[model samples]
Target: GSSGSSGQCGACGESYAADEFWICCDLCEMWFHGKCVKITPARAEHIKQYKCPSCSNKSGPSSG
Candidate 1:
């Protein structure tokens, strides 16, 4: 039996490999993989202090 992986973006319902680069929100706690969100690992890492897009206005410095 093969176990499938879960979606990266809970908001968009998209899935990616576990090894893929992913980002989580500090405020909303939502998960987003780099590729799924069209972001590169370097870029994502560069903006480590970013927040989730949904939580940007409410939480501040949100990422996609």
Candidate 2:
């Protein structure tokens, strides 16, 4: 099957829409929907380096 959408969200694993807001993980470059990850438009700006749950938990920035 062909991919109808541009990309798949890391959180919901669903096809994203242009009308919706989305963000990419700075580490792995994975795409995530803002709504799915609870990232507001304003909040996104404040994030210096946004890491997805997988990257953050699996292999986080600093263990201790």
Candidate 3:
């Protein structure tokens, strides 16, 4: 049986592509495409708490 996909990227508002990489923001609980938000695979894993563009923008710069 096949299941349907729901929801879009918080930044681009596009449905998740079958072949593209998508990530979820822990803070916003939203999904985002790696390329859409410029999130590299390594960086995505490097950061403990991932934040979408909007959340990160409002939250200010990272501690670095």
The candidate maximizing TM-score is: 2
User: Per-residue lDDT tens digits of candidate 1, residues 1-64?
Assistant: 1447654475575656567677766877678765554567888767764566556655345533
lDDT preference between candidates 1 and 2, better one? 2
Q: Write the per-residue lDDT of candidate 2 for residues 21-56, one digit (tens) a residue.
A: 777687787778777766786788887667766577
TM-scores for every predicted model: 0.52, 0.65, 0.58
* Model 3 TM-score (2 dp): 0.58
Point out the worst 10-residue segment of candidate 3 by lDDT: 1-10
Off by over 4 Å in 3: 1-6, 42-48, 59-64
The TM-score measured for candidate 2 stands at 0.65
Instruction: Please give the lDDT score at residue 42 for candidate 1.
Output: 86
Candidate with the larger TM-score of 2 and 3: 2
Measured on C-alpha atoms, candidate 1 has an lDDT of 0.63
Q: Residue 48 in model 1: shift from native, Å?
A: 2.0
Off by over 4 Å in 2: 1-6, 60-64
